[PDB]
Design a protein around this ligand. Sequence first.
Ligand SMILES: [Cl-]
Ligand SMILES: [Cl-]
Ligand SMILES: [Cl-]
Ligand SMILES: [Cl-]
Ligand SMILES: [Zn+2]
Ligand SMILES: [Zn+2]
Ligand SMILES: [Zn+2]
Ligand SMILES: [Zn+2]
Lengths: 279, 279
Amino acid sequence: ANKPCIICVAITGSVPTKADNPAVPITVSEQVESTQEAFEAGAAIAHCHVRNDDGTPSSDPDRFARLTEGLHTHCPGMIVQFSTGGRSGAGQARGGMLPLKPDMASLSVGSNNFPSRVYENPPDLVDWLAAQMRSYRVTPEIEAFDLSHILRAIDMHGRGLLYGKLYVQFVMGVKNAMPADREVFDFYVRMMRTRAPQAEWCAAGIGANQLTVNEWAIAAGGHTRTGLEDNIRLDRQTLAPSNAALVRRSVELCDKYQRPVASWQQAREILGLPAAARN
Amino acid sequence: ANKPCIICVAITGSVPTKADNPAVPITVSEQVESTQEAFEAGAAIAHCHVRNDDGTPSSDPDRFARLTEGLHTHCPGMIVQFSTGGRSGAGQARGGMLPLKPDMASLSVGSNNFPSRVYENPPDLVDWLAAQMRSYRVTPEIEAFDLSHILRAIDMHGRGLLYGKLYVQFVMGVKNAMPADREVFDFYVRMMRTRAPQAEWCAAGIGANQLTVNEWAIAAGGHTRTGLEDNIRLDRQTLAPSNAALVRRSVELCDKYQRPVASWQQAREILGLPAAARN
Ligand SMILES: [Cl-]
Ligand SMILES: [Cl-]
Ligand SMILES: [Cl-]
Ligand SMILES: [Cl-]
Ligand SMILES: [Zn+2]
Ligand SMILES: [Zn+2]
Ligand SMILES: [Zn+2]
Ligand SMILES: [Zn+2]
């Protein structure tokens, strides 16, 4: 394509533990180190959650602040994207980190099932989170778990609800949500190209679908995500030894399709972000 | 097509009240009368909720039993479909009417947003409701509020989770869910035709989209739903005077597209139901 490809690394998430894979970074220091390697390997965006030291989920703003400072000092220029995840926190707590003014924050605009629960995003919460992102000038990345979420995001964006330039992530392979289905993927891409041609998109696959969805996205001209949050293995059994190892796989696919890996500067420009991180 | 078209009437729902439109049937007697007229007008399936006398939502099995007896005596042969709706009840209460052995029951297999809330269908509840429908030999009608729900239903059906023959309803126009979008509709139809060619489908539109979605479904060879549950008006302002009036609109569209209105006998055969109601 020669079009640069933005690789996002989803470093930790809310679910995986060191019992699942010893490579999962849990503490801030672990996260900074893991993220730096990933940055070096080609990731331009860090998609961040925080944890308690024991690995349990957290939404604590002070932990986000600590992580951010580490990323700003060790990964200068890298785009810092905070989760507002529903497995990491509940209600308005899910937006308590927003006043820190990250570059970006992931945002669900719909609800859907998850492996063991409803992933709840009530309309009032969606609207509140979106308003906070307008206030603090935080560009959302929309985490679209189903088709109507893509359409909703497009409508919202046109209506001014979503700060900045529209960036939609197709999340595929989550149990009880949307599987990694190639025909659906192509329809998703069609919706973006036809209904939101000025917007950007990416795609993320879970588990064994991570690498496959990377390939789909990269070959189709979009952007993509990888990392331990989404997948802890290299095949049916083999554990992935780092976030960076997963990034390198994505990089190889960029090479295969003759697309440069977007630098953090390119990624900022593509996504309509400030040229330098705030704060 | 000359293919018969099954018209379902959604008589009451959980939301509309007599304050919204005086034609909404609330009590069992009202419901039987309204349903009979609709039956006479061409509806083969009654999609039923029950209410307290004051119009508030209910899941009471005894009220379902009463309604069923009325429909069996006044609308003999008509297919009786019970709601397991999340606005009418919570948790396993949403399946408490199933032991009455209706012909069918509506079932959500995913979650999604609604006008003012998350429409919660946790995976454990979906699985429980499905198991109850297997036990009691109640054929589900899948209420698909988004694309992944259609795919999930197809997968479930192939795996034996869904009793009887697969029947999927595309529900379009619910605020914060999936809008009535023609391109999505055509994709939905493609999924059914290609992924589940032995299955049947229908489509239902909310509000001002009711008539439009009727036309889309009827012209495309599928089946459809109408009724006061889904829409209380005939245009921007004019109230619909009965469930039957809404059915007649659907019938006109069948005439337009040269499709006969399925008799209740045809509908039973198409949907793989017993030739006569149990009990
Ligand atoms: Cl879960
Ligand atoms: Cl490596
Ligand atoms: Cl609601
Ligand atoms: Cl009429
Ligand atoms: Zn995340
Ligand atoms: Zn800083
Ligand atoms: Zn209903
Ligand atoms: Zn009976």
